[PDB]
Design a protein around this nucleic acid. Structure first.
Lengths: 180, 96, 79, 108, 97, 97, 83, 95, 108
DNA sequence: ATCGATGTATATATCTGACACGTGCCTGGAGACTAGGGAGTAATCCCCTTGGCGGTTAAAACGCGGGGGACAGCGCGTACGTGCGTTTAAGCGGTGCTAGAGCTGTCTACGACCAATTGAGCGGCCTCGGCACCGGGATTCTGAT
DNA sequence: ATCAGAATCCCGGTGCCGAGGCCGCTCAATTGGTCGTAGACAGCTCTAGCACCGCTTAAACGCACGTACGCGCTGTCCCCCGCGTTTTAACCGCCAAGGGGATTACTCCCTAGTCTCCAGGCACGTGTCAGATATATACATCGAT
């Protein structure tokens, strides 16, 4: 194709490795939420840059909502220094970028019915229970959601080259399955 | 010549003459009374069987019949039927 | 077509015994269908009871047992 | 061997306790049948028969008839409150219905 | 001439047929209906007379009780005339449809 | 501000409570009702937890089926509101009165 | 011990919730006392039968089985509590 | 140890793993399946008891159970259940 | 010397022909129980279990939850026509209802 | 038209109690052999279902005027739905304890079984009185006035 | 109120057939004795139900307000009812036949009962994983805007 898919959600996980308490993190931060019946962990949100915070008492840190991979690294660093200035010891090891989410538009509709009938083992479409079409090729572990409009969103990636190679790999079949 | 088919006809007639010594009863009404007695017998014996199976017992006693009567029949009817059954079982035990 | 033999006066007589003052004109075909469904159920169970006894005549006791199976116990034809 | 007093006479019943015992044993209701169970059951059957026959004789006298017909048994059952609950899912043949007309059908 | 108001002789007929115990369907058309219905289940069937009579008493008791429930439906809808939708409501509330 | 029309949130509650399976009567007031009702029949009864759960499932299934029949009665009378006479008609046609 | 004013513990929102499961769009105000009376009648029938089953067993605690048999005796068969 | 209490769980489990070879089942649905099997057993055996007592027979054969199945179960369910039962009785008497 | 063998295997069944036979004899259903009656009855119970579990597994797949809960059995029973006729007077606990709204209550 | 708040159908994360499964035991189910009685089969008989003829009359079909009831439209007012602030009690999580469910052991009362007796109950026959139909008079509602 | 007029009800008479009573018979209940077993009672364990207490928070509750719906009224027209006439087919009675259901007698094979034996199924322990539930992204809907 040629267009870079715009990265939307960069979900990563960093280990902290320490004994924490929930009331002190819930009270010594800003814009946090704790509902005990839903989770035994405190939820929080940071506006600059936007990333939803997910704090565990076992020394675990889950970042979501970063705009890029370097944004996720600096967000995990910010959360780490938040944990250091409240009074515990946070570190920056085992940076696991388990989810990379990117979106773009091909600007042309794609005929879902043709990809459902030609690739019935690869896809399945029903109009009232799932408007999106699922596609899974074999060289990455990847789930695809091509839409009627032609919207293409990728998720579950570890590096953005996977979304690039999978977009250039799915571009031929939607390129021979145009619609107006 | 034909099979001696069992029937409650003479007992319903005796009870009718006990409660109404001049009133009689038709044959179709006698068949309705016979099938009524058979139906209520099958209901009380079926629920007595259920009561014996629920409590893992093998004997239908008068307690099973009393509880099955208290289950089947509505309130004042069931209390008077329990009174009649208890009087008759005590009269049967007082005799040999 | 003997289902029509359940005549409009007969359905009117059944409704008068049911205490019905005024009867619409579409009542009769639905009542004939309802009666045919009821008789189909009862006759199916009675013919099942007949075939089980290896008989070929439908006795009144088969109809009575078929009615008790539905829960429409009927007095006056044995039991 | 003394004179064989019928079991029904002992219990003071008209209904046959021995026949009820034979039907309880041959009906496969349980493995065993106690001695007082047919006495109790025959007493209950006699009481219910006496109740229906009393109310049916009352209905036949109110209709100024001597014999009880199915119509009198039907009037007796459907006019009693608890007998209508006991025989709610029971059709009495040749019994008809209760003479009941709804109030909105009666005129000015 | 002379003429009754519509519904007076009908109410007198209600009183007549609630006073009586006779069978309101005629015997032979009902017997033909029973045999026609039975034919599909098994061919070459006979019927005792008491069987056909028992079916008549059950069918008429069912239809009379259904017409009482239908009348309750019609009175409930501020009507006196029973419609087929009254029969459908009566059969749905009993649990038959 | 914001305001819903009367009856849209009602249908959303209909869809929610027909989609869900929980018990809709609360457990302790129902258990207190069960014990007071059982008090007349006999005294010093102890109720197993499962017994009160079974009574609650059966009672709510009975009430839900009765409200379905009541809704049929109300729609039959060209209404949307269920009246107590709808419950009385449903319970008489079922055979409970 | 002694219990009263509990049928009104079957509250008006609870009856409205049961009607919403019944598919009822709109409820009169006189519904709730009728529904409380109906529920009281049903519970009296089932509980009377359950007590009779409990007594016949010479017990003093009403088991789940007793309720299930009391509902099967009335044609309201209930699955999921034993058999 | 508590006294042995029989149940139909293992069988319903084997039927589930034949039919839907990857799904599980909750224990409440298990108790529902056990009470369903017991209820249908009581229904068919009660109708077989009535059929044996009506025709003055003292045995419950496969014919009494087959006729009780035709009376209890609804139409297409009754045809397929009669077919499966006859197949099993032939496979049993052949072995 | 036929050390290991069962009746369910001979009848090609998973349901126990021995337990079903013991329950038929201990249930006081008749004086005697034929040899093919528990085989036929276990086959019928197996077929009905297979039908309900098949429809419940389809409901579970449609609802994307692998485990079978009471709600899936209730949806399977009330959505099948003939199983709803078999279990019309049966309450399945924790089952809920079918999502059915009447058409006159739905708006413009 | 429009828009945004609200549910909804797919992506990952961890957490948890319930569900799957692995194990020991034991008691219930299977193999084997037996009698005996219940069920299968064959001939018979009779009764009761099927089928037909005929008449004849009471009931069903059909036509038609009209009246009254279903039904559509309309107005209103009020009762019920919706939303919001308050409070109340249900739910949950521990603590304690003890009635009573449940299981075990023993033994005796009690019910199955069996043979002989016999008398209650059933089948059959006969008769008379309760009941049903018919005719008439009297009363009871019905409907226009 | 009143009066003609259908329609139902009471009284009496004729008939008739089915309910009541009686008698022979036969088989099913009774009585007397024996024997196994089951359940009534005592006693021990230990489960789980009740009673209480404290905290939380979501549901219940009271109230304000608006509006949609139940209900009453009016007009219309249509279609069901009441009735007279024609038709038709159910009903009664009477007869013939035959067929199948009930009966009895003989047989044989199929199931209960008993003993042994072992291995399926149940109780229990445990491990792990379906469901739950928070966050982007995307989409029907709903009603004020």
């Amino acid at each position: 194709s040629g267009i870079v898919p715009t990265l939307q959600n960069i979900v990563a996980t960093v280990t902290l490795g320490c004994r924490l308490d929930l009331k002190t993190v819930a009270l010594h931060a800003r814009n946090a939420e704790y509902n005990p019946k839903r989770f035994a962990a405190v939820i929080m949100r940071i506006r600059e840059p936007k990333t939803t915070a997910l704090i565990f008492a076992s020394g675990k840190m889950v970042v979501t909502g970063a705009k890029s991979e370097d944004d996720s690294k600096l967000a995990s660093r910010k959360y780490a220094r938040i944990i250091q200035k409240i009074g515990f010891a946070a570190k920056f090891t085992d940076f696991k970028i388990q989810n990379i989410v990117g979106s773009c538009d091909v600007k042309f509709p794609i005929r879902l019915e043709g990809l459902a009938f030609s690739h019935g083992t690869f896809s399945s479409y029903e109009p009232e229970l799932f408007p999106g079409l699922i596609y899974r090729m074999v060289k990455p572990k990847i789930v695809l959601l091509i839409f009627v409009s032609g919207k293409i969103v990728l998720t579950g990636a570890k590096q953005r080259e996977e979304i690039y190679q999978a977009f250039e790999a799915i571009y031929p079949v939607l390129s021979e399955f145009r619609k107006m | 010549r034909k099979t001696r088919k069992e029937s409650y006809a003479i007992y319903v007639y005796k009870v009718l003459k006990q409660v109404h010594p001049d009133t009689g009863i038709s044959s179709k009404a006698m068949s309705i009374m016979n099938s009524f007695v058979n139906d209520v017998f099958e209901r009380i014996a079926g629920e007595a069987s259920r009561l014996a199976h629920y409590n893992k017992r093998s004997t239908i006693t008068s307690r099973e019949i009393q509880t099955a009567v208290r289950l089947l029949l509505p309130g004042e009817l069931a209390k008077h039927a329990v009174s009649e059954g208890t009087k008759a079982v005590t009269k049967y035990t007082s005799a040999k | 077509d003997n289902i029509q033999g359940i005549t409009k006066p007969a359905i009117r007589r059944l409704a008068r015994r049911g205490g019905v003052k005024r009867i619409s004109g579409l009542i009769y075909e639905e009542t004939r269908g309802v009666l045919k469904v009821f008789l189909e159920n009862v006759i199916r169970d009675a013919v099942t009871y007949t075939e089980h006894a290896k008989r070929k005549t439908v006795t009144a006791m088969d109809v009575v047992y078929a009615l008790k199976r539905q829960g429409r116990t009927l007095y006056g034809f044995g039991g | 061997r003394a004179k064989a007093k019928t079991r029904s006479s002992r219990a003071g019943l008209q209904f046959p306790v021995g026949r009820v015992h034979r039907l309880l044993r041959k009906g496969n209701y349980a493995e065993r049948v106690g001695a007082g169970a047919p006495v109790y059951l025959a007493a209950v059957l006699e009481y219910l028969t006496a109740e229906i026959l009393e109310l049916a004789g009352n209905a036949a006298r109110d209709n100024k008839k001597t014999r009880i017909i199915p119509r009198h048994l039907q009037l007796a059952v459907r006019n009693d409150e608890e007998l209508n609950k006991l025989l709610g899912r029971v059709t009495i043949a040749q019994g008809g219905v209760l003479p009941n007309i709804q109030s909105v059908l009666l005129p000015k | 001439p002379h003429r009754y108001r519509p519904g007076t002789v009908a109410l007198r007929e209600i009183r007549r047929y609630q006073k009586s115990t006779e069978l309101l369907i005629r015997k032979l058309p009902f017997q033909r209906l029973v045999r026609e219905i039975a034919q599909d289940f098994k061919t070459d069937l006979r019927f005792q007379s008491s069987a056909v009579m028992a079916l008549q008493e059950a069918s008429e008791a069912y239809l009379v009780a259904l017409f009482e429930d239908t009348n309750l439906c019609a009175i409930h809808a501020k009507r006196v005339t029973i419609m087929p939708k009254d029969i459908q409501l009566a059969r749905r509330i009993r649990g038959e449809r």
